[PDB]
Amino acid sequence: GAMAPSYRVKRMDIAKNDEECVVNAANPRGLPGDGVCKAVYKKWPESFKNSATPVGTAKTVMCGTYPVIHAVGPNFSNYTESEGDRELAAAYREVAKEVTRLGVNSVAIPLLSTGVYSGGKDRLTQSLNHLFTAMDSTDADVVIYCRDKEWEKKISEAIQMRT
Numbered sequence: 574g575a576m577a578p579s580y581r582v583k584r585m586d587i588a589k590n591d592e593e594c595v596v597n598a599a600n601p602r603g604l605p606g607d608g609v610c611k612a613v614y615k616k617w618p619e620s621f622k623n624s625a626t627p628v629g630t631a632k633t634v635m636c637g638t639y640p641v642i643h644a645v646g647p648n649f650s651n652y653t654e655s656e657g658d659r660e661l662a663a664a665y666r667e668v669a670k671e672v673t674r675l676g677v678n679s680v681a682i683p684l685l686s687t688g689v690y691s692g693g694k695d696r697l698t699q700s701l702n703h704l705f706t707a708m709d710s711t712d713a714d715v716v717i718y719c720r721d722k723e724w725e726k727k728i729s730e731a732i733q734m735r736t
């Protein structure tokens with residue numbers, strides 16, 4: 574575990590993370606995809622061997638000795654708000670189990686279902702709160718990766734509020 578487990582946020586490509594493992598915002602079929610998933614495919618293509626897994630689950634595949642945790646958030650274009658919320662919560666709980674099993678001291682994580690799976694809604698708070706519910710009981714350093722400057726400020730504020 575980390576000496577003083579923390580949350581941090583960085584605005585940069587998650588493929589250039591400084592953590593001991595990465596969470597991919599994966600699709601259920603283990604395809605290269607777009608956004609975070611395509612950056613992860615470019616950086617760790619070996620991690621997409623038998624990475625297909627259902628919505629609401631996480632499957633880890635090693636790239637050398639570096640773990641890639643494929644986490645499948647719901648596409649809110651297809652799920653009801655109620656069922657999508659349940660699957661999004663579940664995906665993060667499976668990420669917490671994998672992070673724990675791997676024995677890493679740190680993990681790089683994107684906000685699941687906030688891009689092309691968002692169904693055109695802002696889900697920063699929804700996705701971040703499910704991330705916290707899952708990861709609060711873990712002792713890994715968590716570093717959240719985002720693209721947008723306004724999201725960086727809102728994520729930083731949400732972390733500092735609980736402190």
Ligand SMILES: OCc1cccc2c1OCCO2
Pocket residue numbers: 584585586587719720721
């Ligand atoms: O530009 C900042 C930035 C932030 C997050 C992800 C990015 C990125 O740049 C292009 C590659 O992907």
Ligand SMILES: OCc1cccc2c1OCCO2
Pocket residue numbers: 585586587588608609612683688718719720
């Ligand atoms: O455009 C989305 C995207 C693409 C590539 C890497 C990213 C990322 O967003 C979160 C931070 O890491």
Ligand SMILES: [Cl-]
Pocket residue numbers: 584585586589
């Ligand atoms: Cl970058």
Ligand SMILES: [Cl-]
Pocket residue numbers: 598685686687688689690691
């Ligand atoms: Cl997404």
Ligand SMILES: [Cl-]
Pocket residue numbers: 719720721724
């Ligand atoms: Cl973002």
